Write a protein that holds these residues in place. Structure first.
Motif, PDB file in Angstrom:
ATOM      1  N   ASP A  24       0.807  -1.216   0.000  1.00  0.00           N
ATOM      2  CA  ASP A  24       0.000   0.000   0.000  1.00  0.00           C
ATOM      3  C   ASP A  24       0.844   1.271   0.000  1.00  0.00           C
ATOM      4  O   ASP A  24       0.454   2.276  -0.611  1.00  0.00           O
ATOM      5  N   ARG A  25       2.023   1.235   0.621  1.00  0.00           N
ATOM      6  CA  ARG A  25       2.814   2.458   0.702  1.00  0.00           C
ATOM      7  C   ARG A  25       3.585   2.737  -0.575  1.00  0.00           C
ATOM      8  O   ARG A  25       3.710   3.892  -1.000  1.00  0.00           O
ATOM      9  N   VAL A  26       4.077   1.677  -1.206  1.00  0.00           N
ATOM     10  CA  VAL A  26       4.832   1.779  -2.450  1.00  0.00           C
ATOM     11  C   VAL A  26       3.945   2.153  -3.635  1.00  0.00           C
ATOM     12  O   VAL A  26       4.346   2.962  -4.483  1.00  0.00           O
ATOM     13  N   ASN A  27       2.745   1.576  -3.745  1.00  0.00           N
ATOM     14  CA  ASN A  27       1.979   1.856  -4.959  1.00  0.00           C
ATOM     15  C   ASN A  27       1.536   3.317  -5.073  1.00  0.00           C
ATOM     16  O   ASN A  27       1.576   3.876  -6.177  1.00  0.00           O
ATOM     17  N   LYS A  28       1.089   3.957  -3.989  1.00  0.00           N
ATOM     18  CA  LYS A  28       0.869   5.407  -4.073  1.00  0.00           C
ATOM     19  C   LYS A  28       2.158   6.165  -4.395  1.00  0.00           C
ATOM     20  O   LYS A  28       2.129   7.181  -5.098  1.00  0.00           O
ATOM     21  N   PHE A  29       3.287   5.662  -3.923  1.00  0.00           N
ATOM     22  CA  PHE A  29       4.558   6.281  -4.259  1.00  0.00           C
ATOM     23  C   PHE A  29       4.841   6.116  -5.740  1.00  0.00           C
ATOM     24  O   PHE A  29       5.347   7.043  -6.370  1.00  0.00           O
ATOM     25  N   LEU A  30       4.578   4.943  -6.315  1.00  0.00           N
ATOM     26  CA  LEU A  30       4.872   4.788  -7.740  1.00  0.00           C
ATOM     27  C   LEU A  30       3.926   5.682  -8.527  1.00  0.00           C
ATOM     28  O   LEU A  30       4.282   6.211  -9.590  1.00  0.00           O
ATOM     29  N   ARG A  31       2.748   5.909  -7.947  1.00  0.00           N
ATOM     30  CA  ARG A  31       1.715   6.772  -8.506  1.00  0.00           C
ATOM     31  C   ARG A  31       2.178   8.220  -8.547  1.00  0.00           C
ATOM     32  O   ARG A  31       1.961   8.918  -9.546  1.00  0.00           O
ATOM     33  N   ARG A  32       2.805   8.687  -7.459  1.00  0.00           N
ATOM     34  CA  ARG A  32       3.324  10.048  -7.437  1.00  0.00           C
ATOM     35  C   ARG A  32       4.318  10.323  -8.576  1.00  0.00           C
ATOM     36  O   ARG A  32       4.381  11.461  -9.058  1.00  0.00           O
ATOM     37  N   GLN A  33       5.129   9.342  -9.001  1.00  0.00           N
ATOM     38  CA  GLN A  33       5.956   9.579 -10.192  1.00  0.00           C
ATOM     39  C   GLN A  33       5.136   9.403 -11.465  1.00  0.00           C
ATOM     40  O   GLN A  33       5.319  10.150 -12.438  1.00  0.00           O
ATOM     41  N   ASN A  34       4.200   8.456 -11.440  1.00  0.00           N
ATOM     42  CA  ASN A  34       3.300   8.181 -12.557  1.00  0.00           C
ATOM     43  C   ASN A  34       4.054   7.974 -13.879  1.00  0.00           C
ATOM     44  O   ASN A  34       3.815   8.653 -14.882  1.00  0.00           O
ATOM     45  N   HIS A  35       5.056   7.025 -13.837  1.00  0.00           N
ATOM     46  CA  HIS A  35       5.802   6.616 -15.026  1.00  0.00           C
ATOM     47  C   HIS A  35       4.956   5.579 -15.763  1.00  0.00           C
ATOM     48  O   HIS A  35       4.362   4.695 -15.134  1.00  0.00           O
ATOM     49  N   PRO A  36       4.893   5.663 -17.091  1.00  0.00           N
ATOM     50  CA  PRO A  36       3.979   4.792 -17.844  1.00  0.00           C
ATOM     51  C   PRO A  36       4.410   3.338 -17.920  1.00  0.00           C
ATOM     52  O   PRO A  36       3.545   2.460 -18.018  1.00  0.00           O
ATOM     53  N   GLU A  37       5.705   3.039 -17.810  1.00  0.00           N
ATOM     54  CA  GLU A  37       6.175   1.659 -17.895  1.00  0.00           C
ATOM     55  C   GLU A  37       5.887   0.861 -16.631  1.00  0.00           C
ATOM     56  O   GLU A  37       5.948  -0.375 -16.665  1.00  0.00           O
ATOM     57  N   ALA A  38       5.575   1.530 -15.520  1.00  0.00           N
ATOM     58  CA  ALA A  38       5.457   0.843 -14.244  1.00  0.00           C
ATOM     59  C   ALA A  38       4.175   0.022 -14.174  1.00  0.00           C
ATOM     60  O   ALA A  38       3.150   0.362 -14.775  1.00  0.00           O
ATOM     61  N   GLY A  39       4.258  -1.070 -13.411  1.00  0.00           N
ATOM     62  CA  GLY A  39       3.142  -1.934 -13.110  1.00  0.00           C
ATOM     63  C   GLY A  39       2.911  -2.023 -11.613  1.00  0.00           C
ATOM     64  O   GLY A  39       3.657  -1.460 -10.810  1.00  0.00           O
ATOM     65  N   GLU A  40       1.885  -2.795 -11.251  1.00  0.00           N
ATOM     66  CA  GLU A  40       1.548  -3.011  -9.850  1.00  0.00           C
ATOM     67  C   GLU A  40       2.626  -3.810  -9.114  1.00  0.00           C
ATOM     68  O   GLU A  40       3.295  -4.680  -9.682  1.00  0.00           O
ATOM     69  N   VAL A  41       2.816  -3.470  -7.837  1.00  0.00           N
ATOM     70  CA  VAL A  41       3.695  -4.204  -6.923  1.00  0.00           C
ATOM     71  C   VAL A  41       2.852  -4.917  -5.871  1.00  0.00           C
ATOM     72  O   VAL A  41       1.919  -4.329  -5.308  1.00  0.00           O
ATOM     73  N   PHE A  42       3.105  -6.210  -5.695  1.00  0.00           N
ATOM     74  CA  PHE A  42       2.512  -7.017  -4.638  1.00  0.00           C
ATOM     75  C   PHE A  42       3.575  -7.367  -3.600  1.00  0.00           C
ATOM     76  O   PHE A  42       4.614  -7.947  -3.949  1.00  0.00           O
ATOM     77  N   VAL A  43       3.304  -7.077  -2.330  1.00  0.00           N
ATOM     78  CA  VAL A  43       4.193  -7.468  -1.242  1.00  0.00           C
ATOM     79  C   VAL A  43       3.493  -8.500  -0.390  1.00  0.00           C
ATOM     80  O   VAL A  43       2.363  -8.274   0.058  1.00  0.00           O
ATOM     81  N   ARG A  44       4.153  -9.643  -0.196  1.00  0.00           N
ATOM     82  CA  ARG A  44       3.605 -10.790   0.528  1.00  0.00           C
ATOM     83  C   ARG A  44       4.634 -11.288   1.547  1.00  0.00           C
ATOM     84  O   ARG A  44       5.797 -11.533   1.195  1.00  0.00           O
ATOM     85  N   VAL A  45       4.220 -11.402   2.810  1.00  0.00           N
ATOM     86  CA  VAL A  45       4.939 -12.209   3.796  1.00  0.00           C
ATOM     87  C   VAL A  45       4.582 -13.655   3.468  1.00  0.00           C
ATOM     88  O   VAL A  45       3.406 -14.034   3.559  1.00  0.00           O
ATOM     89  N   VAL A  46       5.585 -14.476   3.128  1.00  0.00           N
ATOM     90  CA  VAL A  46       5.360 -15.849   2.666  1.00  0.00           C
ATOM     91  C   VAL A  46       5.760 -16.877   3.708  1.00  0.00           C
ATOM     92  O   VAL A  46       5.648 -18.083   3.436  1.00  0.00           O
ATOM     93  N   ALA A  47       6.286 -16.453   4.856  1.00  0.00           N
ATOM     94  CA  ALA A  47       6.651 -17.375   5.918  1.00  0.00           C
ATOM     95  C   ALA A  47       6.786 -16.605   7.215  1.00  0.00           C
ATOM     96  O   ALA A  47       7.306 -15.480   7.238  1.00  0.00           O
ATOM     97  N   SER A  48       6.355 -17.237   8.296  1.00  0.00           N
ATOM     98  CA  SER A  48       6.586 -16.673   9.613  1.00  0.00           C
ATOM     99  C   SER A  48       6.567 -17.829  10.605  1.00  0.00           C
ATOM    100  O   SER A  48       5.782 -18.769  10.450  1.00  0.00           O
ATOM    101  N   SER A  49       7.427 -17.765  11.615  1.00  0.00           N
ATOM    102  CA  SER A  49       7.484 -18.824  12.617  1.00  0.00           C
ATOM    103  C   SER A  49       8.244 -18.289  13.816  1.00  0.00           C
ATOM    104  O   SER A  49       8.965 -17.294  13.725  1.00  0.00           O
ATOM    105  N   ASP A  50       8.114 -18.992  14.934  1.00  0.00           N
ATOM    106  CA  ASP A  50       8.742 -18.599  16.184  1.00  0.00           C
ATOM    107  C   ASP A  50       9.988 -19.429  16.422  1.00  0.00           C
ATOM    108  O   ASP A  50       9.908 -20.660  16.438  1.00  0.00           O
ATOM    109  N   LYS A  51      11.129 -18.770  16.630  1.00  0.00           N
ATOM    110  CA  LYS A  51      12.418 -19.450  16.745  1.00  0.00           C
ATOM    111  C   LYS A  51      13.118 -18.932  17.982  1.00  0.00           C
ATOM    112  O   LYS A  51      12.661 -17.990  18.629  1.00  0.00           O
TER     113      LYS A  51
END
Ligand SMILES: *O[P@@](=O)(OCC(C)(C)[C@@H](O)C(=O)NCCC(=O)NCCS)OP(=O)(O)OC[C@H]1O[C@@H](n2cnc3c(N)ncnc32)[C@H](O)[C@@H]1OP(=O)(O)O
Ligand SMILES: [Zn+2]
Ligand SMILES: [Zn+2]
Ligand SMILES: [Zn+2]
Ligand SMILES: [Zn+2]
Length: 531
Positions: free
Chosen positions: A204-231
């Motif tokens: 959510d923070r990056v996509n509005k930022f990419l929006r502020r530059q509004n470059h035409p080549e840019a696409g959507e960014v997805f950020v995913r936590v893909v693992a978490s555990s207690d160690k």
């Protein structure tokens, strides 16, 4: 040997030659570069008895023109295979500096521009020969898939086909235009990996930022936590007998580790460009690790579009991670800015040959600008290097320095068993950062069990065995495709579903088409579908 494909595409000699030979002529037109390649290499004219012991399958223009006039080429790939054999012989026998070697590389760049559009109008992906990078004389070949309708062989990586996603097999795009049917959608996307508040805050923070530059080549960014555990991190034997047995430090320190990745849409497919593992020591962790986050590993592949926004987006993710954990209650963050040794990849298995590995000064300037951006934007209050921070706080004991898994300092101290340490500390001041962000810590996110992303080794190992390189845009697209299937289908978490209203377990349920993860017991303002 049994075989069969009834509606296979077969090419009559005249069709191939009329299509293929305009490419063979562009090689002959290269003067003087084609001249050593217009006839078979004659070792007795050139003075090289070496040659036929080294080159076992000679090839040249004339032989290819012969096969192409005789009709000896059944499929177009057999033609392309023979020119690359020509190029590969020369690249092999001659040294990389010789004239002919450079003649060859000119012929090859000419063939590459000519053969691609031709093979694509003949219904193939390209006219290249691909091999995977060297592992620990021979190289492994890229894989092919055959269209179940055409029978025309294609590069699996070019067409991005995988039986797990599409189990009824590969059907070419043109045969699908006659088919009426488009390709079915790949449901194993990055966007569709389980969402989290941590992941959501960063994207959510990056996509509005990419929006502020509004470059035409840019696409959507997805950020995913893909693992978490207690160690827990175990104090190593030296410091252990010197301080835990005395009861001055705890024997082990609990932390939660998380692995997260960012993906960008490029040419309508997911491309993974950024990855990071972090260690988070909460508010019940004893000193000296109480309320600390540590960036274990940070890795990257430079294909983000556009190039002029790539780093700024990396900073936004990093700057974003600090803002998030500060909000949950962490107090200090720590970065060890160390560039990889040898040709060791931190997270991704085969970086581009031409992605620069920075000098540590470059790496430290990078972090320097990164932290400064956060202070200015009022997320970081301040940051210092370890010395200005350590004795500004006046630590005199080794047990007051944070003690993180896999970090440098537990092993400098561990070897110091036989043996000065404050001097060991001063030599590397600039590479080790202490980041100041400023009521228990409560992680609102649940744990994601994913052995593949449980630390950095598992994904590196699987990608080496399966050749998921991140060395080019086309390989990164494929590697990402398969990475995402692994996360979707071989994770270790099983999902129980609960109604957000009644706290009850649900099987049949109404799921919201708009909300992040919203279900209602059948027993709400949004349209709902039954799942
Ligand atoms: O593109 P960057 O923002 O990448 C920063 C990363 C730390 C993400 C990256 O280097 C990476 O993926 N590292 C993985 C392992 C690692 O080091 N982890 C440490 C975590 S603290 O900016 P860079 O610093 O990569 O490069 C920007 C430009 O600098 C050039 N460059 C880098 N290294 C160079 C060396 N050794 N010599 C000369 N130039 C060097 C790059 O070519 C970049 O320039 P462009 O003009 O953009 O091509
Ligand atoms: Zn191809
Ligand atoms: Zn087909
Ligand atoms: Zn809803
Ligand atoms: Zn219910």
């Amino acid at each position: 040997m049994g075989s069969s494909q009834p509606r296979k595409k077969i090419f009559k000699p005249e069709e191939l030659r009329q299509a293929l030979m305009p490419t063979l002529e562009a090689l002959y037109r290269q003067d003087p570069e084609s001249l050593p390649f217009r006839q078979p290499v004659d070792p007795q004219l050139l003075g090289i008895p070496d040659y036929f012991d080294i080159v076992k399958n000679p090839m040249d223009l004339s032989t290819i023109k012969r096969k192409l006039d005789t009709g000896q080429y059944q499929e177009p790939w057999q033609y392309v295979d023979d020119v690359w054999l020509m190029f590969n012989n020369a690249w092999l026998y001659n040294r990389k500096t010789s004239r002919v070697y450079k003649f060859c590389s000119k012929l090859a760049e000419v063939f590459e521009q000519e053969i691609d559009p031709v093979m694509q109008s003949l219904g193939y992906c390209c006219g290249r020969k691909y091999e995977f990078s060297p592992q620990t004389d021979t190289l492994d070949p890229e894989p092919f898939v055959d269209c179940k309708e055409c029978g025309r062989k294609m590069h699996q990586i070019c067409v991005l086909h995988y039986d797990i996603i599409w189990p009824s097999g590969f059907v070419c795009d043109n045969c699908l235009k006659k088919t009426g049917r488009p390709r079915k959608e790949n449901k194993f996307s990055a966007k569709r990996l389980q969402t989290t508040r941590l992941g959501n805050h960063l994207e959510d923070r990056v996509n509005k930022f990419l929006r502020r530059q509004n470059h035409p080549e840019a696409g959507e960014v997805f950020v995913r936590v893909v693992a978490s555990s207690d160690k827990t991190v175990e104090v190593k034997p030296g410091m252990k007998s010197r301080f835990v047995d005395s009861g001055e430090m705890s024997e082990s320190f609990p932390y939660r580790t998380k692995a997260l990745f960012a993906f960008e849409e490029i040419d309508g497919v997911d491309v993974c460009f950024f990855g990071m593992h972090v260690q988070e020591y909460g508010s019940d962790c004893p000193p000296p690790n109480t309320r600390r986050v540590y960036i274990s590993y940070l890795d990257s592949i430079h294909f983000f579009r556009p190039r002029c926004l790539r780093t700024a987006v990396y900073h936004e993710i990093l700057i974003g991670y600090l803002e998030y954990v500060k909000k949950l209650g962490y107090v200090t963050g720590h970065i060890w800015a160390c560039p990889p040794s040898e040709g060791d990849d931190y997270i991704f298995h085969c970086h581009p040959p031409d992605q620069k590995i920075p000098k540590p000064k470059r790496l430290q300037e990078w972090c320097k600008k990164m932290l400064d951006k956060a202070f200015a934007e009022r997320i970081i209050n301040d940051y210092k290097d370890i010395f200005k921070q350590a004795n500004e706080d006046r630590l005199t004991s080794a047990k007051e320095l944070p003690y993180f898994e896999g970090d440098f300092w537990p092993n400098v101290l561990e070897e110091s068993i036989k043996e000065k340490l404050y001097a060991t500390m001063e030599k590397h001041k600039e590479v080790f950062f202490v980041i100041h962000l400023h009521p228990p810590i409560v992680d609102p996110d649940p744990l994601l069990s994913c052995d593949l992303m449980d630390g950095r080794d598992a994904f590196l190992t699987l990608a080496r065995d399966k050749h998921w390189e991140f060395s080019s845009l086309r390989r990164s697209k494929w590697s990402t495709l398969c990475m995402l299937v692994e996360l979707h289908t071989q994770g270790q978490d099983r999902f129980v579903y609960t109604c957000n209203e009644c706290k009850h377990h649900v099987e049949t349920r109404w799921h919201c088409t708009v909300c992040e993860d919203y279900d209602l017991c059948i027993n709400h303002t949004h349209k709902m579908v039954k799942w």
